[PDB]
Amino acid sequence: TVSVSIKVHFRKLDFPAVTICNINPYKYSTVRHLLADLEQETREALKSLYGFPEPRFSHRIPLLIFDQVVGFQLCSNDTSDCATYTFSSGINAIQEWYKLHYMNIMAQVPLEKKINMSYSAEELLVTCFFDGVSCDARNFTLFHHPMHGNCYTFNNRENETILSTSMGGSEYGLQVILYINEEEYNPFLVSSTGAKVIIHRQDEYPFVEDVGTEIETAMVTSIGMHLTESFKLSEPYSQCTEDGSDVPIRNIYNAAYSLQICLHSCFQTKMVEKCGCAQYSQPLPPAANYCNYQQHPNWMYCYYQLHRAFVQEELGCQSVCKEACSFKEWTLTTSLAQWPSVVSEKWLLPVLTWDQGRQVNKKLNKTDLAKLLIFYKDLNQRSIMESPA
Amino acid sequence: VSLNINLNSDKLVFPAVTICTLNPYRYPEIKEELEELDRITEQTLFDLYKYSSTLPHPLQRLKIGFQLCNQNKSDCFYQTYSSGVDAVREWYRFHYINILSRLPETLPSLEEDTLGNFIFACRFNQVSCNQANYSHFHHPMYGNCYTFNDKNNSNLWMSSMPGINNGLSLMLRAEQNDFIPLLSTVTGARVMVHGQDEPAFMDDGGFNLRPGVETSISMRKETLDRLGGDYGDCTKNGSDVPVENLYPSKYTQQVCIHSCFQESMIKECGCAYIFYPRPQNVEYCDYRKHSSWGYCYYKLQVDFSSDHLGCFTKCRKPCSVTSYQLSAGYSRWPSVTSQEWVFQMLSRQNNYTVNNKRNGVAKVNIFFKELNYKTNSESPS
Amino acid sequence: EVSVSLSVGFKTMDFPAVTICNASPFKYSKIKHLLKDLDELMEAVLERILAPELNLNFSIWNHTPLVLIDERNPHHPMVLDLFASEKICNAHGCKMAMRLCSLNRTQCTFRNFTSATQALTEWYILQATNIFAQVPQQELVEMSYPGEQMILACLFGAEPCNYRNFTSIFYPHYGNCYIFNWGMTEKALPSANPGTEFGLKLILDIGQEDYVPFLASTAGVRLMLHEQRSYPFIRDEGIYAMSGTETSIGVLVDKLQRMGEPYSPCTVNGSEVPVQNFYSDYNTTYSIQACLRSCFQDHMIRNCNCGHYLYPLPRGEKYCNNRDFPDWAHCYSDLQMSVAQRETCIGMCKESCNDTQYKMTISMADWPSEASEDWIFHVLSQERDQTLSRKGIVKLNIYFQEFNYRTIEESAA
Ligand SMILES: *[C@@H]1O[C@H](CO)[C@@H](O[C@@H]2O[C@H](CO)[C@@H](O)[C@H](O)[C@H]2NC(C)=O)[C@H](O)[C@H]1NC(C)=O
Ligand SMILES: *[C@@H]1O[C@H](CO)[C@@H](O[C@@H]2O[C@H](CO)[C@@H](O)[C@H](O)[C@H]2NC(C)=O)[C@H](O)[C@H]1NC(C)=O
Ligand SMILES: *[C@@H]1O[C@H](CO)[C@@H](O[C@@H]2O[C@H](CO)[C@@H](O)[C@H](O)[C@H]2NC(C)=O)[C@H](O)[C@H]1NC(C)=O
Ligand SMILES: *[C@@H]1O[C@H](CO)[C@@H](O)[C@H](O)[C@H]1NC(C)=O
Ligand SMILES: *[C@@H]1O[C@H](CO)[C@@H](O)[C@H](O)[C@H]1NC(C)=O
Ligand SMILES: *[C@@H]1O[C@H](CO)[C@@H](O)[C@H](O)[C@H]1NC(C)=O
Ligand SMILES: *[C@@H]1O[C@H](CO)[C@@H](O)[C@H](O)[C@H]1NC(C)=O
Ligand code: NA
């Protein structure tokens, strides 16, 4: 038998890592030459299917009209079975079809070239501020994401102490101003405009698409968080594992153990064994290659059968993976308000563009600058420990 | 007892999503009764605020408020308001409720595409949900509501993995020009996530949406299980509670409270409240049938808030309490580089007249933040 | 060994105290006569940085000169004061700092900043606080946003209200704040019905045309939900609210009752703390945040013989001005940017055994519709005048959710 004990502490606590990342992965003017034929083939689908007045691309997955319902099908090598995806909306069909080829065109591009084409630490950030002392682009660690381009974490850099906050409030916490160039957004890949951040530990892998919270690009967003830790007994009571030592699955994320990390690593391992390529949305396992219809033409249907057998619990990943005993959580409190007022906008934009002079030549617009406030409202650290009885 | 907190790693069933619009649809049956009500309001504004665009309770300035009295006109009291915005809104609401009870008790016979004009796109877990069974009901203050993934639907939405890609994706239409401007004074939409069988309380757990922004709503499921009888006074059914369940759903705290208040509304005032369900015999309230029901309702809330009716003592708490915490992440959905083909696509398929002043259409994303929802269960010691 | 008991549900309880503070502390139309020389000097600093090619009062500039540190040459670092291109360096090796001198410009320190947009805000706040600390409060309140023009409407369930039902206090950072249901004089109003119809409905007027340009950037309105006899600390626990939208706030009272003194270092009344409470003029209950500000204000008076403007002042002391205590700029900087003194006060201050939080969910929507914008703005303007746009009106709907409380009580077992 176990007994829970909820106790709060009031002291200087560590500040988590903030994985700031723009939803637009690359400037469209930079990757236009790679997605030139994809953009041409996409607009031809609009004029044909919807009747508009007006790394290589593969014409094996086109948009068809199924019985005003449009979509595409993913067949196998023998063309016996085809995984079809129907769409009732036009904008929903284009974004899914464009992202399908986008994930395959960018998968055959070298990683070093992709990082150079994405945003830099000085281009995405305009102003950094944390606990009085002003930070810079050197205080952020690179984190390349296949969908959002280059992400930058505030904490979690090698050979450096963890920043801790000792005074709660919106002024003694992270206060960053992001530059979101809406003019270079991909028209078909990403729909909305803005940034998104992830609150996680220094040893936790940030899932941008899964647990990421978007941020509006026109106004300030204050995020007040409360630290809530939980501990559970491992061996005799809950069978939970710690540090990922009991499970035999290899961790390809190079971070702390988690259930979502164990499931993704198990699915990635089962995918490389089934078909020769590895999924592009997840990190690449050692001694493997990403998936693309140019080199692996029969992976669109291969991933379909694996994902179909993963939900039904047939691959053998949900049974072997175990939940982590200890983990942290930050209860985010989001609040929005118009950052540049009618009067302060006259002097903020001319100065905000003076700092980012090398990256921006024109004047910054109100809809391009997003301010973000992340802090602890209180120093109350609530810990939920389960002691044996 | 002893508290035991644990995490359940199972197939998370997606909760029922109730999507309501923020413009009450004026029925053609009560069009002649509503146009008269608008003429009285426009005349009221012109006499008080000089704004230039017989009812029993006229709106007059004494503050501004209408007089509520009993049957024999003995205990007359004025329900005043501070501003004219709240005064006209509540005064129009009162008369709108009465004329809304005069609708026939027959089922509709004119099948109109009222859902396709509101929901532009439905897609859950990369599967389109445009052709799916739903339940339609018209809320008095809000507009038409549509509940998806209800108990009556055999195909239950199963969330395999957490994240935006494996969640519900909606695209609603926020009508800028409401049908009733004197009552509907908000643009957008409301979304409520509740149990598979639990009803839709849009006032209790409603989540507004701004027109023209993508709202990614993260759901955190929190359940509490406790024992009943000798360990606690909770009930796992409705037989222990003498209050008759008027909602076609399971037993809940607010379901019993609304049912217990409705029974007191019928016994004292003689008429059932519109915002709450009614039995097969009792009819709703109306100032023509019942000479005075607003006075009886106001005095009933005073006794209800002071725990005089006993609805809080009779209605026990359910042993299984499930909650959904909503955390939203906003971002402008129409991008300056995509407004060309996106707004033109809606004009070709949905015939949406694009307005350069205000955005209108709004996108919504609903999903689970964590796959292991916290489960708090009590155990004896 | 203590037992933890969790109980969530709905019950009749008092409505939380709603504190309303404007984004700007004062109205620029009534304070421009006091910030005339400062704003005239700030415009000169902007012109010096933005367009250098295109009289002043140096008595304000000599208090804290904003200098430029050009150290991209490792063998010759130079510090140039702002007051053939004559532009100001903004490269990777250059930076802008504030020179804070202590005694006759001898013990001068530098508060370094990387971007100019941050150094200009910190410099203006320090200069504005220097002017706001040498003006009486009875005169400093009348030059802020009054409650007559801010609160345009108030409706708690079925009972109306106005600016007279809001307790007016002066928060030194946000100006005049108004608490809807505090409970110092009258009893708190309970609410036993969940929903927006039975909650608090407010229509606020945020005047952005009277905002201070170089002091107030955000154009929202601060909101805070606290207890009945607790001082509202807006900067720590406070949320915003967009202008021109309907911010629905569903309240959930999350409480945690500790066991007691022999089981945890928590206080009940709060009189066991060594430091004296400077918020005694408000007759509020003990708060951990009030103790962190009483110690800092006490340490502020201890080092330099003056107290800061953003904190209460004991009877007999004096605020930190520039004509009396020119060393207050270096004094306050050494105490604000010091983690050592912060850890000492946390050890002296104790927490309350009964803490209360409000897990509120914020949901917004554009309130003024195209069909109702005509008559709504015409009525509000008629009541206020006898001036209103999308950027002014704010709609707030505070209410209780289906479950309004979640208590975690500890019992000795
Ligand atoms: C960003 O990184 C720099 C160095 O990489 C940090 O600067 C150091 O700051 C500490 C103060 O805590 C000094 O003791 C060191 O001497 C500084 N070193 C250098 C090389 O400048 C800076 O503090 C970081 N920013 C934040 C907000 O932590
Ligand atoms: C602000 O920046 C200045 C210059 O970068 C710092 O001053 C220097 O201190 C270092 C080490 O103490 C010396 O090697 C330099 O010669 C100094 N330069 C000057 C111009 O004084 C200063 O310490 C920084 N202050 C803070 C609080 O970070
Ligand atoms: C706002 O304040 C007014 C008075 O300042 C309140 O009006 C009183 O309401 C009480 C109910 O408890 C009555 O007993 C009094 O007769 C009323 N006085 C007057 C002068 O009318 C009003 O209830 C308050 N409203 C809110 C929402 O707090
Ligand atoms: C009027 O009716 C009320 C309740 O219906 C009753 O209490 C009151 O005595 C009546 N007054 C007269 C004069 O009949
Ligand atoms: C609970 O109620 C259901 C129907 O409402 C009934 O079928 C069931 O037998 C009841 N169970 C108990 C224990 O009363
Ligand atoms: C500069 O300002 C101070 C106070 O702000 C004032 O006392 C002084 O007279 C001003 N200087 C001039 C030359 O007016
Ligand atoms: C907290 O709960 C205890 C338990 O009864 C009570 O005595 C105390 O007064 C509560 N605190 C406040 C501030 O009311
Ligand atoms: Na509407």
Residue numbers in the entry:
A (entry chain C): 80 to 133, 152 to 164, 200 to 521
B (entry chain A): 114 to 166, 183 to 191, 223 to 541
C (entry chain B): 78 to 131, 139 to 167, 179 to 481, 486 to 512
Share the article's original sentences:
To investigate the structural source of ENaC trimer assembly, we exploited a set of constructs, deemed ENaCFL, which comprises wild-type α and β, and N-terminally eGFP-tagged γ, and behaves like wild-type ENaC as measured by electrophysiology. To determine the structure of ENaCFL, we expressed ENaCFL in HEK293T/17, solubilized in digitonin, and added two different Fabs, 7B1 (recognizes the α subunit) and 10D4 (recognizes the β subunit), to facilitate particle alignment. Reference-free 2D class averages and 3D classifications reveal that ENaCFL channels form as α-β-γ counterclockwise when viewed from outside the cell. However, the transmembrane domain (TMD) and the cytosolic domain (CD) were not resolved; we speculate that preferred particle orientation, air-water interface denaturation, and intrinsic protein flexibility and conformational heterogeneity contribute to the lack of 3D reconstruction of the TMD and CD. Therefore, we did not include the TMD and CD portions in the ENaCFL structure. We observed a map feature located near the β-ball domain and the β6-β7 loop of the α subunit, where residues αGlu335, αAsp338, and αSer344 in the α-β6-β7 loop have been identified as important in Na+ self-inhibition. The map quality in this region is estimated to be well beyond 3 Å and thus the positions of the side chains are reliable. We speculate that this map feature is a cation, perhaps a Na+ ion, based on the surrounding residues, the above-mentioned functional studies, and the presence of high Na+ (150 mM) during purification. The cation interacts closely with several negative charges: the carboxyl group of αAsp338, and the carbonyl oxygens of αLeu135, αGlu335, and αVal346; all of these interactions are within distances of 2.5 – 3.5 Å. Furthermore, the presence of a phenylalanine adopting a different conformation in the α subunit from the tyrosines in the β and γ subunits, near the cation site confers a specialized function for the α subunit as the primary Na+ sensor.
